[PDB]
Structure formats: structure tokens, C-alpha cells
Symmetry: C3
Subunit: 336 residues, 3 copies
């Protein structure tokens, strides 16, 4: 497109919503390319990440960890207004793995506190992609401080299996997995700091051990458990988008499966099927499609079980409906 | 199927055998669905895992690590009787990744010492799948204590390549890879305990470092080496099933290849081919098909060589037959 | 082939070049099978791997880390003359993952200082494959000391996408990723040794923690940055071969993508497409094909960002050409 062609395209302002939920969107594109407008503010703030009051200075897109999922269609133009409040203390930018050029947009979006920038790029490749902050010289630090999220570039005609048949989801949830590296004093307790910059040196030391202290979904242990469990019903088709901007993960739905899984997160690559556990390398997003068949509670975990049940990477799905004794049945309940 | 339909199905009792071997079975299903009966007893016992006398309190299905491989066909019903001897001290259950509902069957099989339970589920998805114990609040601990194994749900018509052509194996071996976390005293020596529960706290501390002390095949360093090496002959087609219920691994056959590899372990996903090294994420099972072409000794390892040659993840294949100088030949033997 | 048939085949001597570059070769094979001759000398020498003067006793094929990439065509015979200078102190051999039998050739190439050997094998499987030293009892130590590289067995008709259409590259670069384990004294400083053997015990201790101190491309931090950056131009098709003989990696081209990626590195397995980040398990080589669309500087990294920006796994691509405002444009430059 020429400058004149792009400016003439229909435009749409989308109001982002907090994860695990996703803003309203149509799976199958209606009409020609559009310029889709998103606005995100950067918030540097303290968040508690576990039941023991552990705090961390998060650098979050729209104040959440992970940042919100943005959805557009292949060949749409994503036009983002990124604002860095005069209230913040660090420079930030954004790098879309979905984009082409200038370090994913990082080289054109360096904004200091009190500045804003508007970046536009054409979403040429379909799939789910990671996006994260990446300021020269401080890349890992901003990412493992929670400054990352994902976008989804849906094919114009919606999703399809390898065979080429349509896959329509009833619900979609976005699970952002985050590895945190919280420094511990000489006595084992987690340290606290006044400002982000004060925790840098100590945090880098933990990072170099490549061993995270916490691995959580939606920014905190238990964030998606109990009453904040994701929901579904027997018969419902669910797309679960999962991202990890820095470290490997291996999602597993306990009691379920990944009927169709784009483990690489790219829609032009046929999905693997009937997966028990899939693998998403650090720096990538993936997606799993599943149709619930049994009611009850399910757990959704990173299957290095130590990371899931000790470090925090576990979420719940509460599913309603009728039990199917054909798929599974207790012939003899536990008995003497 | 209705209750009446299932109870009318032909039944078969299978006597399980110890890994790396697998019970008798037909690759191509003969007849309609069947209800396949398996019985497993849980044994909590001390096992030595290396040549230095290191001991561990294993929680093992049928007394072995890994537990035995169970084989059925897609759409068969697996009916398991699980027994927890009054002699044991902990509650145990079983979670089949092959199953649908109730946390893979874990929610319907919680049995205390002196109890038994009978669980039945329909094997709807073909492939090799992990199964492991997963009692609420103590999941990782029972798994890395060796309470895991795998099952194989063969397609009704046996295995086929992506092209859709039949793949018949002459032999099949099951290699269960286990990551152990043995506590070390203030002097570096491995600690020993009187009962399983006594080692819990110290073992959890090691688990949190995500660094295993041992990574072995068949429950011990050297378990499948020397005189317990797996065997084959030139011309023989071998299926090597590999599982890891908690941590990633990257199998490699030294001097060989993975001609066809279902790295994800699911038969409806076409296999990768001509693999030098394949990857199996923690919480999954995979399978590799290979036709031996050269006689001699081969090593089968997890290709993080430190884990293979220092930590214990190495096994041997002893292969008989005639040497093929076309594939490889020493033109000039080592000489001055 | 019979002995007489092989000796009658046309022969070619290839002069190897230092990575990231690759010796001259034709992508599409011209004529029938050939016996391709390569010569490599082993050099045990001290190399500095970072800007702080950290030294390591490298064991390098042709004096570089990684060793050079050798290219032949499927069904060609690779005939290697391996020389171990009387000047060296250790026994060495070579294990090609591309080969069949005798532990990849390791069992027929054990040479002490002052000896040489000539090994020949038929390249039956197409793809990029790792090769490394593997002397009995000291395998990991020689590999993580840099004694590894890769070869590429191109299909006779060159590369093709899954669809079966030709993929011709203008340039090809070979990035060998190396995990080093340098011992640190009681004060944190990196230790130095007089001879290779002297560092063994201390180095094994670091290896067992499975935590590398450095992760670099081409044997050193910054090796492929600044003025040694790899180059390309907008419109050019580049094949980037990547190997890791011991540990997992997840390559990512910042500002770009992997248009076609043989993540497993085997050409008979269709490539994944539109990848943001791909995964290469330890003990394997992979390849990514990409067509540059935007000029500027790109970073090529292992996407565990801590390993990339803290440990050393980062390289640069300097690309010339015209900027495409359709793919990306700064609508509002950073401003108050
Ligand atoms: Cu930032
Ligand atoms: Cu990135
Ligand atoms: Cu148990
Ligand atoms: Cu599991
Ligand atoms: Cu060597
Ligand atoms: Cu190897
Ligand atoms: Zn990994
Ligand atoms: Zn794949």
C-alpha cells in the first residue's frame, strides 16, 4: 500500500481488556484490511506475587502481567500508541515478534517518562506472537520484570486444522507465563526495594543462575485458581493461548488434552494433534484448541511438576455439564 | 457404549512384565473393542541408584522404576485394578495422560494403604502417554520418587508412516527416564532416611533448584548397560518408547538415527524423519522407530552429554550381524 | 557400492574455511556420487572468550570453535583425514551424527598425539548434523571444550519447501553455539590453568550444575558483533545453520523471522514456517531460511534473553537496502 491507500483504510479503535480475557473480535475477517488502533500505558508498580507477600517491581503494559492480548487479522495494520507516564522512572519501548524491521519496532519506540510514540506495522504472518520491552543494555531485566505479552494475527478466514477444515472456538483465554527472579538476603527471605533501579544489581545476580524463584500464570501464584478459575462447559470449544517471553514451558491440561496444538504458534504450520503435553520455547507463544467432554475441575500446568506445584505455574478450569461414564467410570470406588 | 454394551465386550487379562521389556501384544487389533484388564500393586521401597550405594525411597508401580508399559488399542477400554498394600505408608492414585476426566483418573483413585480401586477409561487417542501418581498437595514428590510409567494406545491397524504405509517392529523396548533429587549433607555425601516421609522436606529443597542429582534409565545408573544391554540384530526394526514424566530430555542413538520419530508421542501426528536427536518435553512420552544396519555396540543417551555421561542417562544396545563397508569403513586405521 | 565402484568414483578435495563462513559448494548436485575429501587438524589451545580476559583450553577442529561446516550431497561419501599433532596432549576422535555405525565413527578414529586416521562414510540422510569428539570416559569434557561442529548433507536437487518448491539461498552462515563451564575460585574470579588436563576436575564440578558460565556464538562473546557482523542485503535469501552439541537453544532473529525452519535440521521433514523463535535440542543442528525485507541492524539471539544478553549468545546482521514504510513506519516519533 501507498501512504494514500493506508490512510484511506477503515479504522477501528479497540479497548483492551485484562488477561486471561481477550477483547471482542471476529474470528473471520469482515471486509478488507483495516488499521486497528490500540493504546497502552506503561505502569511501573509493585505487585505481590505469592501468598507470602513477596513483592516485585513490575514494568507492565496496561498495568497487568502479562500485558493484554491484541487481536488483528493477517494483513491488517496494527497502529499502537504507547505512552510512558511522566510518573515512571525508566525508558521503555516495544518489540513485536509479529513485526518486520527496526528490531521488531524497538528501535523506533524508545520513549522516556513523559513521552509517547505511535508505531504502525503490517501483520504479514498469521499466528500468536510474543511482544516485549527491549531497551538497549537492559533487555532481560525489563522482560523478566513482566513487560511482555502477546498478540494474535488470525488468518482472514479464521482457524483451520491441517486438513483445511474450520476450527471455531466458543471461548479463548490468554495465559501469560512469567519467570521471576527475586533476590534473597543472607537468611533466605525475599528482599524488597524502594525503586525499580535499586533491585537491578541483585536481580541480575539471580538471573545469571538461570533458576527462577517463581514461575506463575497471570502475574501471581494462584492468580487463576479458586474463584478466578477459567470457565467452560461440556461441549464448548476453547482456544488457550500461552506465551513465555524468556523461558521454556510445557503446558498440560490435567484430565484433558490439546486436540489441535500450534506448538510453534504459527497458523501456517499444521497443528500437532491429540497432544498430552506440548512445548513452547522461550521467546514464543503457542495455542491449544480443546473440546471439553467431562465436567469438573481441571488443572492447567507447566508440566515440569516442580515448577507447577512448587513454583506457581498452575491454573484451574471449572467445567459444568454431565459426566460421561463411557469415557471414564469408577467400577469399584476406593475400598478396603 | 451403554453399560450393557461394555459389560458384554470380550475381556482379556494381561500379565505385565518389567521394563525395558513389554507384555505380549498384537500390533494390529484383531476384532472389536475389548476391555483390557491390568493389575498393579504399589510398592514403597528403598532402591540403590548408582555404583556408590546411593539409596532412595521409591514409590513404584509393580515395584519397578519406571512402572510397566501397558499396551491396548485405540477404543479399547483399559480396566485397571490398583492395589495399595496395607504395608505402605502413603496414599497414592493414578493419573493417565491417555484418559479424559477426573484429573486423568486421579480424582477417582485415591487409595490409602490397605485399599484398592478399579478404574476404567476408554482409550480414545492413539500414541504413547505418560501415567503417574498425583496425590493432592504432593504431586511432584511422588513423581520424582519414581511413581510414573507409560502406556501405548496403538492405532487399530498398527503403526504407519506419514505417507500412510505400514511400520511393523520386530522388537520394542521401553526406556523410562527418571530425574532424582537426592539430598546431600553438609559434607557432600548423599543422605539416607528410615521412611519416605522423613526425606520429604530435604527432598523438596533439592527439587526447588530444578537441578537433579541423577538422571537415569530404568531406575539406576548402568541399569541398561553391560550384560543388561538391550539387543537387536542387523535388519531388525526396533521401536524405542521413551518417557519423562517431569523433565525434558533429548534422546540420541549413538551410531544410529531415529528413522521415524513421533517426538510428541501421538500417532495421529505424522512422524519426523531421519532424526539425529529428538526432544521429549517433561510430562510426555515419545517413540522412535529404527532399522539397524551395522552390528556392534551402540549407546542410547539423553544428549545433554553431561546428563548422559555424568548423571547416568546412558544405555547400551548390543547388535549382531555383518559389517557394511559401504556405509562406513576405516580407510587408514589410526597410525603414526 | 563395491570397493571397486567406490574407488572409481570422481574425487574432490575441499579446502575448509573458518566459521561463520562456509566453503564453496553447489546447492544442486552436478553428476553422480563423489568421494569428497576433507582434512582437519586438531588444535589444543588457549582462547579468550569474553571482554574480561577469561581463558579456556579449547580442543578445536581446525583451530576454531565451532569446527568448520563440511558440505556434501546425499549419497556422496565423505572421506576425512583427521590429524592429531604430536604437539597435543590428549587422544581425540570424531563422531558424525550423519554417519551409521561404530558410534558415528568414534570407534574407528581414536588417535593419540602424533597419529592420523582416514575415515569414510556414506551420507545417506539429508539435513544438517552435529559432529563432535567423544573419547570413551571423557565425552562431555571434549565437547564443552569446543570440540564440535556440523556438516550439511544437501539433497541432490537442493532445498525445497514442504510444497516441494525450490529454495535457493544467496548466502549461508554457520553459527555454532557453545556452552562453556569455567571454574571460579573462592572469590568469584575465573581460574586459569597451564594444561588442559589440569582443569578437568574443576571443570567437571561446574558441568554437574548444568549451569554454563558462558553461552557464545563462534567461540566468544561479541565474536559476531560490530565489525564481524554477518551481512546481507534487502532481497537476499539467507540460510542460517545453527548447532548446539550439548545443550538446548531457541534462536530468534530480532526484527525478522524464520520463513522456513527445519528445526530438527533434517530435510526430509517438512519445515515449520513463519517462526518467531525456533528450538534446537542439545545434540542437534537446525537451519532457518529467511528473505530480508528491511535494511538496518538485526540481532540474532538464543531467546532465553538472560543467555543472550548476559551470557553471550548474541550476534549481529548488518543489512543494506531501502526502508519499506508499508511493513513498518513511525507515525509519531517519540515525543513529549
Ligand atoms: Cu520496559
Ligand atoms: Cu524477543
Ligand atoms: Cu504415589
Ligand atoms: Cu501429568
Ligand atoms: Cu577431543
Ligand atoms: Cu553426539
Ligand atoms: Zn529445556
Ligand atoms: Zn513438528
Amino acid at each position: 500500500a501507498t501512504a494514500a491507500e493506508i490512510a484511506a483504510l477503515p479504522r477501528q479503535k479497540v479497548e483492551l481488556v485484562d488477561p486471561p480475557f481477550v477483547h471482542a473480535h471476529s474470528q473471520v475477517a469482515e471486509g478488507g484490511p483495516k488499521v486497528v488502533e490500540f493504546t497502552m500505558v506503561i505502569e511501573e508498580k509493585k505487585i505481590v506475587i505469592d501468598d507470602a507477600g513477596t513483592e516485585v517491581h513490575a514494568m507492565a503494559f496496561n498495568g497487568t502481567v502479562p500485558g493484554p492480548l491484541m487481536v488483528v487479522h493477517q494483513d491488517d495494520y496494527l497502529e499502537l500508541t504507547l505512552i510512558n507516564p511522566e510518573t515512571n522512572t525508566l525508558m521503555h519501548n516495544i518489540n513485536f515478534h509479529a513485526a518486520t524491521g527496526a528490531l521488531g519496532g524497538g528501535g523506533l519506540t524508545e520513549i522516556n517518562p513523559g513521552e509517547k510514540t505511535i508505531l504502525r506495522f503490517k501483520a504479514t504472518k498469521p499466528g500468536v506472537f510474543v511482544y516485549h520491552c527491549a531497551p538497549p543494555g537492559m533487555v532481560p531485566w525489563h522482560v523478566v520484570s513482566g513487560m511482555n505479552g502477546a498478540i494474535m494475527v488470525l488468518p482472514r478466514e479464521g482457524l483451520h486444522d491441517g486438513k483445511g477444515k474450520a476450527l471455531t472456538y466458543d471461548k479463548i483465554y490468554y495465559v501469560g507465563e512469567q519467570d521471576f527472579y527475586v533476590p534473597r538476603d543472607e537468611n533466605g527471605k525475599y528482599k524488597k526495594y524502594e525503586a525499580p533501579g535499586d533491585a537491578y544489581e541483585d536481580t541480575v545476580k539471580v538471573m545469571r543462575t538461570l533458576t527462577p524463584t517463581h514461575v506463575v500464570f497471570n502475574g501471581a501464584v494462584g492468580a487463576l485458581t479458586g474463584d478466578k478459575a477459567m470457565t467452560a462447559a461440556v461441549g464448548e470449544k476453547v482456544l488457550i493461548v500461552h506465551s513465555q517471553a524468556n523461558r521454556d514451558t510445557r503446558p498440560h491440561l490435567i484430565g484433558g488434552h490439546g486436540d489441535y496444538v500450534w506448538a510453534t504458534g504459527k497458523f501456517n504450520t499444521p497443528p500437532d494433534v491429540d497432544q498430552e503435553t506440548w512445548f513452547i520455547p522461550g521467546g514464543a507463544a503457542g495455542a491449544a484448541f480443546y473440546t471439553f467432554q467431562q465436567p469438573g475441575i481441571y488443572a492447567y500446568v507447566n508440566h515440569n511438576l516442580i515448577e507447577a506445584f512448587e513454583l506457581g505455574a498452575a491454573a484451574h478450569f471449572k467445567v459444568t455439564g454431565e459426566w460421561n461414564d463411557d469415557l471414564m467410570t469408577s467400577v469399584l470406588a476406593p475400598s478396603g
